[PDB]
Design an enzyme around this catalytic site. Structure first.
Site, PDB file in Angstrom:
ATOM      1  N   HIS A  65       0.962  -1.209   0.123  1.00 48.76           N
ATOM      2  CA  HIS A  65      -0.027  -0.020  -0.037  1.00 48.76           C
ATOM      3  C   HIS A  65       0.945   1.249   0.166  1.00 48.76           C
ATOM      4  CE1 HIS A  65       0.715  -0.825   4.085  1.00 48.76           C
ATOM      5  NE2 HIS A  65       0.070   0.027   4.607  1.00 48.76           N
ATOM      6  N   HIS A  67       1.384   3.855   2.016  1.00 52.52           N
ATOM      7  CA  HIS A  67       1.983   4.337   3.569  1.00 52.52           C
ATOM      8  C   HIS A  67       3.304   4.536   3.226  1.00 52.52           C
ATOM      9  CE1 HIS A  67      -1.889   3.719   6.475  1.00 52.52           C
ATOM     10  NE2 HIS A  67      -1.884   4.997   5.869  1.00 52.52           N
ATOM     11  N   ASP A  69       5.653   3.957   5.380  1.00 52.60           N
ATOM     12  CA  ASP A  69       6.399   3.022   6.068  1.00 52.60           C
ATOM     13  C   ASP A  69       6.765   1.572   5.182  1.00 52.60           C
ATOM     14  OD1 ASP A  69       3.777   2.864   7.050  1.00 52.60           O
ATOM     15  OD2 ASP A  69       4.297   1.187   8.191  1.00 52.60           O
ATOM     16  N   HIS A  70       5.831   1.534   4.044  1.00 54.62           N
ATOM     17  CA  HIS A  70       5.870   0.450   3.168  1.00 54.62           C
ATOM     18  C   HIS A  70       6.409   0.922   1.582  1.00 54.62           C
ATOM     19  CE1 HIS A  70       3.397  -2.283   5.851  1.00 54.62           C
ATOM     20  NE2 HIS A  70       3.425  -0.924   6.373  1.00 54.62           N
ATOM     21  N   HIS A 143      -7.777  -1.382   5.267  1.00 55.79           N
ATOM     22  CA  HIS A 143      -6.782  -0.459   5.844  1.00 55.79           C
ATOM     23  C   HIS A 143      -6.891   0.865   5.067  1.00 55.79           C
ATOM     24  CE1 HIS A 143      -2.962   0.573   7.783  1.00 55.79           C
ATOM     25  NE2 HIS A 143      -2.149   0.547   6.786  1.00 55.79           N
ATOM     26  N   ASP A 164      -0.407  -4.339   5.394  1.00 54.28           N
ATOM     27  CA  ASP A 164      -1.106  -4.065   6.577  1.00 54.28           C
ATOM     28  C   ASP A 164      -2.602  -4.211   6.065  1.00 54.28           C
ATOM     29  OD1 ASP A 164       0.921  -2.903   7.848  1.00 54.28           O
ATOM     30  OD2 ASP A 164       0.590  -0.799   7.439  1.00 54.28           O
ATOM     31  N   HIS A 370      -5.913  -1.766  11.694  1.00 56.55           N
ATOM     32  CA  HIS A 370      -5.095  -2.723  11.686  1.00 56.55           C
ATOM     33  C   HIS A 370      -5.822  -3.966  12.401  1.00 56.55           C
ATOM     34  CE1 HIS A 370      -1.220  -1.076  10.403  1.00 56.55           C
ATOM     35  NE2 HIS A 370      -1.527   0.067  11.231  1.00 56.55           N
ATOM     36  N   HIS A 392       5.466  -6.903  11.671  1.00 52.11           N
ATOM     37  CA  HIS A 392       5.158  -5.273  11.587  1.00 52.11           C
ATOM     38  C   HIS A 392       4.474  -4.925  12.959  1.00 52.11           C
ATOM     39  CE1 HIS A 392       2.570  -1.844  10.499  1.00 52.11           C
ATOM     40  NE2 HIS A 392       3.386  -1.822   9.516  1.00 52.11           N
TER      41      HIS A 392
HETATM   42 ZN   LIG Z   1      -0.100   1.161   6.703  1.00 51.65          ZN
HETATM   43 ZN   LIG Z   2       2.580  -0.064   8.052  1.00 53.44          ZN
END
Ligand SMILES: [Zn+2]
Ligand SMILES: [Zn+2]
Ligand SMILES: [Zn+2]
Ligand SMILES: [Zn+2]
Length: 433
Positions: A65, A67, A69-70, A143, A164, A370, A392
């Site tokens: 996705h 985000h 952090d990904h 998500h 996620d 989440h 994660h």
């Molecule tokens: Zn996320």
């Molecule tokens: Zn994440």
């Protein structure tokens, strides 16, 4: 009667939340799952341990996705690196991608971001694609818009990576699907560990009451959120609440972010993944300079972690007044200001270096979407994977999830299951006939 060894190893998000990046190795194939940055880190340390391998040997790269952090490190990995494989992501993901990193920049330059676009292929949900000797397809993860859970098959061996995900339907997002095709291995997030917080109806009521309480006592309410994602859900909730309470109609609600105009535009382009997004009590705000901070109000501003930018600027001009209040609606990552505040510090440090007392209220009402233990357990029970790899979540939450799952299957159902708890750089080894 041979046997092939599969190797799974996290370079990011191993026993932590942030910079998701997991490597799969099987029968000469090498796959990278996600490539983000750690929100609580800066510079080159915010990146995953990619140095443990060479980007030239990676055949396929799958991004779950949008985000940060990904996919926060993707532009860097696609330009400033020796990577020459193929990269895939959901249509909405790529769309919302180009508009998220840009706002983040204001590692890699807006040039590096554009030079990336052409290296990223798109894929529809429930559609098989094949690269090298690898077949893969995705399911809806819930998500955020466009979020996906990738199933991968190599030589008959199947692995599902959740990225996620959320098994609970939003006000506009569908719940993650439970695939009917059974995986041999499941790589799953563990953000919430075993914690099971308030239900949606409760969280929404508390959210509205807190915001109401703040502006009613004459304060400004600050809601840090990244441009797109969960913010869209909060806006629907707020606009609807305001509509039912005319006594609030003179109190402005602002949606502040760089290019918030395209954020909603591009976001509505994918209604596929009355128009409620036609707010009657919310307005866009470009920046601090277009803001007349006159009386009580509510401002939803990025970044979500108040590390810097507008949300941080607003927090700094409002934190000394008891009437004001901030509501943190996302998962607080270590090293983050949002995370620190929730410690009840007597004072905070301005980006300038000034010291200011923290008098404004601070509330935490999570809308990060989440799965929780109940959803995760049900998910695993339906898929029955012999191997589960957690990836994660903070060390302790992950440890608790692992023990709870082991207890549930080994002790309770008296069934055999294997749950892995890999630290960054640590490899997991499995053998298939
Ligand atoms: Zn996320
Ligand atoms: Zn994440
Ligand atoms: Zn009312
Ligand atoms: Zn066993």
């Amino acid at each position: 009667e041979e046997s092939d060894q599969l190797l799974i190893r996290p370079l990011g998000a191993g026993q932590e939340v942030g910079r998701s990046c997991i490597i799969l190795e099987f029968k000469g194939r090498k796959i990278m799952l996600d490539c983000g940055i750690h929100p609580g880190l800066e510079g080159m340390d915010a990146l995953p341990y990619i140095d443990l391998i060479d980007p030239a040997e990676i055949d396929l790269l799958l991004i779950s996705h949008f985000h940060l952090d990904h996919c926060g490190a993707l532009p860097w990995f696609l330009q400033k690196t020796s990577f020459k494989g193929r990269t895939f992501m959901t249509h909405a993901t790529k769309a919302i991608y180009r508009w998220l990193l840009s706002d983040y920049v204001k590692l890699y330059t807006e040039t590096d971001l554009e030079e990336s676009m052409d290296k990223i292929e798109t894929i529809n949900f429930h559609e098989v694609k094949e690269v090298a000797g690898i077949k893969f397809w995705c399911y809806h993860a819930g998500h955020v818009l466009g979020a996906a859970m990738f199933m991968i098959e190599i030589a008959g061996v199947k692995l599902l990576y959740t990225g996620d995900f959320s098994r609970q339907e939003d006000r506009h997002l569908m719940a993650a699907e439970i695939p009917n095709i059974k995986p041999d291995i499941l790589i799953i997030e563990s953000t919430y560990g075993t914690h099971i917080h308030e239900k949606r109806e409760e969280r929404e009521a508390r959210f509205c009451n807190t915001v109401h309480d703040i502006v009613n006592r004459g304060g400004r309410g600050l809601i840090p959120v990244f441009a797109l994602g969960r913010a869209q859900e909060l806006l629907l909730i707020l606009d609807e609440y305001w509509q039912n309470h005319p006594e609030l109609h003179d109190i402005p609600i602002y949606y502040a972010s760089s290019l918030a105009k395209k954020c909603m535009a591009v976001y509505q382009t994918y209604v596929n993944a009355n128009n409620p997004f036609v707010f009657k009590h919310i307005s866009n705000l470009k920046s601090m300079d277009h803001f007349d901070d006159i009386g009580p109000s509510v401002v939803m501003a990025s970044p979500g972690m108040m590390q810097s930018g507008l949300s941080r600027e607003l927090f700094e001009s409002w934190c000394t007044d008891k009437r004001n209040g901030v509501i943190i609606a996302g998962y607080c990552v270590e090293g983050t200001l949002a995370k620190h505040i929730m410690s009840e510090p007597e004072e905070i440090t301005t980006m300038s270096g000034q010291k200011l007392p923290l008098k404004m209220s601070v509330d935490y009402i999570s809308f990060s979407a989440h799965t929780d233990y109940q959803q995760t357990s049900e998910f695993i029970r339906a898929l029955k994977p012999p191997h589960v790899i957690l990836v994660h979540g903070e060390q302790n939450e992950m440890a608790r999830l692992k023990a709870a799952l082991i207890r549930e299957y080994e002790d309770n159902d008296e069934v055999h299951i294997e749950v892995h708890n890999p630290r960054n750089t640590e490899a997991v080894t499995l053998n298939f006939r």
